[PDB]
RNA sequence: UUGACAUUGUGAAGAGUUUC
RNA sequence: GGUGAAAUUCUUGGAUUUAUUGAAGACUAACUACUGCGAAAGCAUUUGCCAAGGACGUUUUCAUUAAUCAAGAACGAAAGUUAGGGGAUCGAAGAUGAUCAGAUACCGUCGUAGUCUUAACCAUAAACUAUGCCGACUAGGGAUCGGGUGGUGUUUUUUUAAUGACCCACUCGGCACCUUACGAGAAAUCAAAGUCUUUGGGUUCUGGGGGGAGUAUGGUCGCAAGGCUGAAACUUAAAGGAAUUG
């Protein structure tokens, strides 16, 4: 698959992990 | 040179063909017809033979009202579009000269801009 | 690997040009890129010329002509057979036919 | 009906995908000033005449 | 089931005095009925015409003129100078690669109150042994050229009406004068005055209207 | 709010004897 | 109308098209090129002001002031953002019409953001010449920009001129292009990608098989988007690039 696309998948996954840990406090 | 001059506006796209006629004034138009009028297929709308008959009936009405000579002015769609005339242009035009209305004073007034607004296709275009 | 010293066409000193819209496929592509072809033709094609010469007031009057500067897109051209593929040296050469 | 005739000046060549059609030039045989191109179906050589319904079309390459 | 074509009357379009073939032609107008006027529907009209037809000259084939309906009179109607224009195949022939295309403009009023924008054009040229292949000019070149062209434009439109302006336009006085002026800098072939537009016009002035008309 | 009737006179012009 | 072809869509409200006039906001075509400018990103109608800058020229001036540079700093497409203004056009979104096994897409129709700018931000792209900067040197040719030298040159008409351009010849500084490979190369291909096992001109920075991984954490800047830095286990004997033959 595309590298730009892998990179964006990771961008979202990281934003999500951040949302999680922020809810976790 | 007593023959009265109108003007025939030939808009020749590939979607259809317009043979419009007025007097030398664009106001009080005389005759207006297409191949989109002269056949029901929806594919050959702009095609020569249909625009051929378009010019045929144009000349017919030109006579029935008494118009005898014409200055011709052709255009493609223009603006920012293909910028090329359609085959209906030549077809109706030749057929006009054949039908025998006096012909003259040819030109292409197809509008051309100074680098004007953007186009359909979004940088990457109507890819087929 | 590299296939053209051009890298396609000649910018080769500036860093930028402005683009255009291909007449068929519309594609925005740079101007120093952007395959070009002039096109001169008549409006009175070789038999309708004769018909007009008879149907014409203003004898001999003129043959105006349609002048169009087509900015082509690459593959659009390639399928139009504006051009075809060429071998290594046929590519190296820059001469018209 | 507005029929006309025209004798072949030149068999231009076989265009059309299947090798059935052939481009021809014909003199309209009433006005030798009239030499027009058309397309045909069948086997053809020179000197022969076609019976033309439309004297106006003058079609082009065929596929 | 009405056929207005057997209802509309006909009228004869006539040109100003500075033209020779002033019988411009014929046109169709609906019959002036009650509470609606053929003459007004005609007043609201304009017509484009080739200068070769205006003058009989085949040198005048490319210049073309809008002519505006000012006065309608008893199957006839007097036209005014509405503006000139310049055919397109000629332009695109003229405009070629390997040279510098130049344009100049100015807005100015006539002697009489006619506000006019004017547009002239020219192109660079090689000279008789110049083996290099483009013959471009420089910034100062183009700048002073456009400067002087605008200068002369303002001068001669000042010293004129629509009448004097057109009377100089037909013989192409202006191109020759700009050539005389701009020869000092550069060869600069292919001088033309491409376009002119009427922006503002004075009150109707039927007197001078008939004056310029009122003959033939 | 819509329409009418009057307040409401003075001239014209004109579409379908008309009264708009 | 619009297309491979269709359809949506608009049309007694007379559309499409004709024409007069006006507005809007837009972008600056043909000139537009193996040509210019600029730190790069990038930069074009017109005109005026502001200051700046290169090259050239220069029997001007000062005398080593400088070259590369971690840290630190100014710039930085497009997208994006906050608040105003502006929003013709296009147009992720979005809704529709087609096609097709489906189409959540290509394609047709409409159309929101933005697209325009403004006061602040963000600091990323093939931001590529994928070739660090400073300086030395080596091999020819002809184009060519700008500056510069000469011409009992051309042309420009006047009374020579002066000038203006143009041609020939020569020189600085730029874009670069072509032949040959002398040299280099893995091979492509390169007058620098040469001077290199005969291994050293100065200087900054970067890289060590692939995956995991610019992932994770932490720090830190950022309103956000995100950015800067930046792992590890674990898994892996192939991945990889140049050229040929098929």
């Amino acid at each position: 698959m595309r590298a730009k696309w892998r990179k964006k998948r990771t961008r979202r996954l990281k934003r999500k992990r951040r949302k999680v840990r922020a809810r976790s406090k | 040179n007593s023959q009265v001059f109108g003007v025939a506006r030939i808009y020749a796209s590939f979607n259809d063909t317009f043979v419009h006629v007025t007097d030398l004034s664009g106001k009080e138009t005389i005759a207006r017809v297409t191949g989109g009028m002269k056949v029901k297929a929806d594919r050959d709308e702009s095609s020569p033979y249909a625009a051929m008959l378009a010019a045929q009936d144009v000349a017919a009405k030109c006579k029935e009202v008494g118009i005898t000579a014409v200055h011709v002015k052709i255009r493609a769609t223009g603006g920012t579009r293909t910028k090329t005339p359609g085959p209906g242009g030549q077809a109706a035009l030749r057929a006009l000269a054949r039908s025998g209305l006096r012909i003259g004073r040819i030109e292409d007034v197809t509008p051309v801009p100074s680098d004007s607004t953007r186009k359909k296709g979004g940088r990457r275009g109507r890819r087929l | 690997p590299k296939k053209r010293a051009s890298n396609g066409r000649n910018k080769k000193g500036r860093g930028h040009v402005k683009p255009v819209r291909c007449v068929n496929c519309s594609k925005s592509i740079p101007k120093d890129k952007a395959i070009k072809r002039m096109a001169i033709r008549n409006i009175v094609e070789a038999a309708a010329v004769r018909d007009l010469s008879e149907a014409s007031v203003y004898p001999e009057y003129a043959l105006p002509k349609t002048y169009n500067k087509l900015h082509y897109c690459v593959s659009c051209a390639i399928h139009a057979r504006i051009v075809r593929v060429r071998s290594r040296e046929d590519r190296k050469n820059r001469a018209p036919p | 009906t507005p029929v006309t005739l025209a004798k072949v000046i030149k068999v231009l060549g076989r265009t059309g995908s299947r090798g059935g059609v052939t481009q021809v030039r014909v003199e309209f045989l009433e006005d030798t000033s009239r030499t027009i191109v058309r397309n045909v179906k069948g086997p053809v050589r020179e000197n022969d005449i076609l019976v033309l319904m439309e004297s106006e079309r003058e079609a082009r390459r065929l596929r | 089931v009405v056929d207005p074509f057997t209802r509309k009357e006909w009228f004869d379009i006539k040109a100003p005095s500075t033209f020779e073939n002033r019988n411009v032609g014929k046109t169709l107008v609906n019959k002036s009925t009650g509470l609606k006027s053929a003459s007004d529907a005609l007043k609201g009209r304009v017509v484009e015409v080739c200068l070769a037809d205006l003058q009989g000259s085949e040198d005048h084939s490319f210049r073309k003129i809008k002519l505006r309906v000012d006065e309608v009179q008893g199957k006839n109607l007097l036209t005014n100078f509405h503006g000139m224009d310049f055919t397109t195949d000629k332009l695109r022939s003229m405009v070629r690669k390997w040279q510098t295309l130049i344009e100049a403009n100015v807005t100015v009023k006539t002697s009489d109150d006619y506000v006019l924008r004017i547009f002239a054009i020219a192109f660079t040229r090689k000279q008789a042994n110049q083996v290099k292949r483009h013959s471009y000019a420089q910034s100062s070149h183009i700048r002073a050229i456009r400067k002087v062209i605008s200068e002369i434009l303002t001068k001669e439109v000042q010293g004129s009406t629509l009448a004097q302006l057109t009377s100089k336009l037909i013989p192409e006085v202006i191109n020759k004068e700009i050539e005389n002026a701009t020869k000092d800098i550069f060869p600069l072939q292919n001088i033309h005055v491409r376009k002119v537009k009427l922006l503002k016009q004075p009150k109707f002035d039927v007197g001078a209207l008939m004056a310029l008309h009122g003959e033939g």
Side-chain angles (χ1 to χ4, degrees):
Chain A
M1 48 163 294
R2 202 192 187 83
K4 190 190 306 216
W5 298 161
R6 181 266 206 289
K7 266 43 182 154
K8 199 176 295 308
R9 258 188 68 175
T10 40
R11 276 205 160 105
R12 281 141 182 158
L13 180 56
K14 184 175 172 70
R15 201 176 62 227
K16 181 185 58 48
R17 285 146 180 201
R18 178 172 54 174
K19 293 278 178 161
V20 162
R21 207 202 62 156
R23 297 307 79 71
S24 79
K25 311 283 201 174
Chain B
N1 224 37
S2 46
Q3 70 285 333
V4 66
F5 271 109
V7 191
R9 293 186 184 286
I10 298 181
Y11 160 47
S13 158
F14 288 98
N15 320 317
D16 214 334
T17 316
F18 282 19
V19 182
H20 205 183
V21 178
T22 70
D23 45 346
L24 267 286
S25 281
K27 292 165 62 57
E28 278 293 349
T29 72
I30 310 316
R32 199 177 48 258
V33 69
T34 82
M37 293 187 68
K38 291 304 174 33
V39 66
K40 284 276 155 80
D42 211 337
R43 42 157 64 199
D44 316 288
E45 289 194 359
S46 77
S47 309
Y49 173 42
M52 199 274 285
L53 309 193
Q56 297 285 318
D57 209 356
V58 164
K61 189 198 315 298
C62 291
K63 177 45 55 189
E64 181 259 1
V65 307
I67 291 283
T68 67
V70 203
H71 310 285
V72 59
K73 293 286 141 272
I74 202 151
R75 63 181 292 288
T77 315
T80 64
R81 290 172 186 264
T82 173
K83 195 55 70 74
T84 302
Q90 169 270 322
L93 188 39
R94 172 181 182 185
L96 178 79
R98 164 154 269 95
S99 72
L101 281 156
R102 301 291 292 152
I103 315 293
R105 310 321 305 242
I106 299 159
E107 183 55 28
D108 289 13
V109 312
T110 193
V112 184
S114 60
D115 198 329
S116 75
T117 59
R118 217 162 148 89
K119 189 181 172 62
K120 185 176 281 288
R123 196 180 183 73
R124 210 186 45 162
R126 195 176 167 282
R127 65 190 70 84
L128 291 89
Chain C
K2 194 182 277 281
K3 186 158 147 168
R4 312 191 201 279
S6 73
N7 265 39
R9 288 308 160 76
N10 47 6
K11 183 164 87 165
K12 311 266 189 133
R14 331 304 187 289
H16 199 52
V17 309
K18 304 180 162 258
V20 292
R21 314 299 294 258
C22 159
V23 292
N24 284 337
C25 43
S26 317
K27 190 200 281 284
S28 185
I29 52 184
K31 176 151 178 190
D32 268 14
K33 213 177 290 187
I35 299 100
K36 297 160 287 305
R37 280 299 105 95
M38 209 83 228
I40 314 304
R41 263 176 205 67
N42 80 97
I43 311 96
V44 301
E45 185 50 55
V49 59
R50 181 266 191 195
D51 186 17
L52 168 56
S53 45
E54 291 111 7
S56 47
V57 180
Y58 315 103
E60 181 263 322
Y61 159 65
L63 276 66
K65 281 181 155 298
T66 184
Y67 300 170
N68 261 356
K69 188 163 167 286
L70 319 187
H71 300 60
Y72 273 116
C73 172
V74 168
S75 289
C76 314
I78 298 166
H79 204 62
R81 59 174 71 104
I82 309 291
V83 172
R84 51 185 186 86
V85 312
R86 337 208 279 284
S87 48
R88 221 163 187 188
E89 79 295 349
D90 299 349
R91 271 204 290 291
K92 291 198 283 289
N93 176 8
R94 289 176 82 70
Chain D
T1 66
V3 188
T4 58
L5 293 177
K7 184 174 71 65
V8 174
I9 314 314
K10 208 263 162 186
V11 173
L12 309 199
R14 306 199 75 158
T15 55
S17 71
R18 288 176 161 182
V21 191
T22 315
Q23 280 191 358
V24 53
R25 178 159 259 93
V26 304
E27 178 251 1
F28 280 4
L29 186 46
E30 49 77 21
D31 179 19
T32 176
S33 318
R34 287 276 184 78
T35 177
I36 291 77
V37 168
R38 280 301 200 91
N39 275 324
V40 73
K41 186 55 160 188
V44 161
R45 54 165 311 292
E46 292 311 300
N47 187 48
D48 49 0
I49 286 154
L50 281 298
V51 182
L52 312 93
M53 313 300 253
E54 268 65 1
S55 296
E56 307 90 325
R57 307 201 309 99
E58 196 171 282
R60 69 162 47 254
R61 58 174 285 144
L62 192 140
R63 307 181 159 190
Chain E
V1 308
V2 174
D3 185 48
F5 305 166
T6 53
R7 241 69 172 173
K8 303 181 241 161
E9 314 160 311
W10 283 69
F11 265 67
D12 183 9
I13 305 148
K14 330 196 288 191
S17 39
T18 48
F19 311 101
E20 293 78 1
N21 176 321
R22 302 176 74 212
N23 55 344
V24 192
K26 283 295 302 195
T27 176
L28 77 174
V29 185
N30 192 1
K31 180 283 198 173
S32 190
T33 77
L35 316 174
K36 178 217 68 49
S37 189
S39 197
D40 289 6
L42 193 55
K43 289 169 187 69
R45 304 202 202 171
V46 187
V47 156
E48 212 160 53
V49 304
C50 175
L51 186 78
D53 308 332
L54 298 171
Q55 301 305 111
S57 159
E58 212 158 358
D59 314 278
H60 297 163
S61 313
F62 50 83
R63 294 200 293 289
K64 58 195 155 169
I65 312 298
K66 290 186 79 172
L67 291 176
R68 147 176 50 78
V69 180
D70 59 63
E71 199 278 340
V72 173
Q73 45 179 62
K75 198 206 57 43
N76 305 337
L77 64 159
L78 312 173
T79 60
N80 188 331
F81 173 74
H82 187 73
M84 175 277 320
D85 199 337
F86 198 94
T87 42
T88 72
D89 75 272
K90 163 58 156 166
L91 289 170
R92 282 279 272 194
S93 81
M94 291 152 30
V95 183
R96 188 59 54 75
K97 222 168 199 172
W98 320 121
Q99 58 88 24
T100 319
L101 179 160
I102 306 170
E103 63 283 57
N105 65 340
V106 66
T107 56
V108 63
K109 185 174 77 194
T110 54
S111 64
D112 55 342
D113 316 330
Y114 278 94
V115 177
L116 305 172
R117 198 171 294 119
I118 177 160
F119 293 161
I121 175 158
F123 300 79
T124 48
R125 205 200 61 269
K126 49 227 181 183
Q127 297 181 136
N129 62 347
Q130 179 169 338
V131 195
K132 73 177 201 89
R133 309 189 85 210
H134 42 281
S135 78
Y136 304 135
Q138 312 208 139
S139 173
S140 76
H141 296 190
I142 305 143
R143 257 181 172 292
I145 292 156
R146 272 163 208 228
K147 180 174 73 66
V148 169
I149 295 156
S150 62
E151 176 252 340
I152 303 150
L153 263 47
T154 40
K155 184 267 154 192
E156 295 288 26
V157 177
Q158 158 269 321
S160 274
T161 68
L162 293 189
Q164 292 82 331
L165 179 44
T166 44
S167 312
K168 301 149 179 193
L169 170 148
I170 296 159
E172 308 100 11
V173 178
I174 186 156
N175 310 117
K176 309 132 187 178
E177 309 218 22
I178 281 97
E179 291 143 35
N180 178 15
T182 61
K183 53 97 182 184
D184 184 300
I185 313 168
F186 205 97
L188 190 45
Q189 63 170 12
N190 201 227
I191 296 82
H192 312 317
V193 170
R194 54 183 277 257
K195 281 173 175 71
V196 292
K197 294 199 203 200
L198 279 53
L199 322 188
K200 193 174 61 221
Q201 305 89 52
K203 62 156 282 301
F204 194 17
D205 190 351
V206 292
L209 186 155
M210 177 280 324
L212 273 290
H213 276 270
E215 43 258 11

